[PDB]
Amino acid sequence: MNGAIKVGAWGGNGGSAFDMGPAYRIISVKIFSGDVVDGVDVTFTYYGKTETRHYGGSGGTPHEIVLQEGEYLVGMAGEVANYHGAVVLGKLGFSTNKKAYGPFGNTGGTPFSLPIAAGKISGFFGRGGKFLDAIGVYLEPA
Amino acid sequence: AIKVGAWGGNGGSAFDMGPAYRIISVKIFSGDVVDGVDVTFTYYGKTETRHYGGSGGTPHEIVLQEGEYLVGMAGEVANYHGAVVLGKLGFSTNKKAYGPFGNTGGTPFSLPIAAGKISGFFGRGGKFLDAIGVYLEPAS
Ligand SMILES: [Br-]
């Protein structure tokens, strides 16, 4: 609605649905991972207030992407894995117009990939519980 | 303004449909792999058919009914006789999922569209369908 374009989610159907909606500015993403992707922090701005939302569980090591001036998110990729009986993100990475980051996570399964030939990622939705069950993205022009 | 993909190889020649006003139908030509696609659509007052890739294999036509639109695309990227191509391709509408068309496995990709629709195509083609990507638009 209101003109949104949402692609995904990739992953399983467990955990609880989340939807950040679209941001004015994503500032940074932290991807928490070990054997699989445990969760994500998204830090974003709105009217000069910086806020952080966490989705998924409390495990894993953090892997950060701090967006530089003129840097924006142009790809996402990973693997959907079966882990301990749950269908979750086993690996997750992102590309910007400047650099690739990751993927983070150590469990393979069914790959997915989202090259954005025109446009950028503008927000996130998905499912989280003990791990990051699923992830999807909002898109807008670049 | 919103283009995702293409998934597939670097061979063949580039194509680019741009976005349509309305997609009427898509035909997927396949045998062992995806040979190519026809897209029939409305565009700036005209009704047009374009063909991308080769024309071998068998055509499989999906005609979109009133209130029906394309909300997913998926497939596998395969090596076929030395060409990195779509080995399998399928589409979902808001009513039903179709496919796969083609028989050759390789690396899967999937594009579920939770909000919006596919409005057109771009990619690369030769004898077969080397690569395919989509233009995306919001729902109306
Ligand atoms: Br349409």
* Domains defined along chain A, listed by start: 1-142 (2.100.10.30)
Q: Is A113 an interface residue toward B (CB < 8 Å)?
A: yes
What is the rounded distance in angstroms from the CA atom of residue B121 to the CA atom of residue B48? 14
Q: How far is CA A101 from the centre of its chain?
A: 12
What is the rounded distance in angstroms from the CA atom of residue A24 to the CA atom of residue A122? 8
Resolution of the model in angstroms:
1.7
What is the rounded distance in angstroms from the CA atom of residue B139 to the CA atom of residue A41? 29
Q: Is B110 an interface residue toward A (CB < 8 Å)?
A: yes
- Considering CB atoms only, which of B3, B110, B138 is closest to A118? B3
What is the rounded distance in angstroms from the CA atom of residue B39 to the CA atom of residue B52? 8
Ligand 1 ion local residues (Cβ < 5 A): B 22-23, 69
A100 prior amide bond cis, ω within 30: no
Question: Per DSSP, what are the bridge partners of residue B107?
Answer: B77
What is the rounded distance in angstroms from the CA atom of residue A95 to the CA atom of residue A73? 6
State whether A6 and B116 contact (CB < 8 Å). Answer: yes
Question: What radius of gyration do chain A's Cα atoms show?
Answer: 14
For residue A133, give every residue at least 6 positions away whose Cβ sits within 8 Å of its Cβ, in sequence order, or none.
Answer: A11, A12, A13, A14, A15, A56, A86, A87, A88, A89, A126, A127
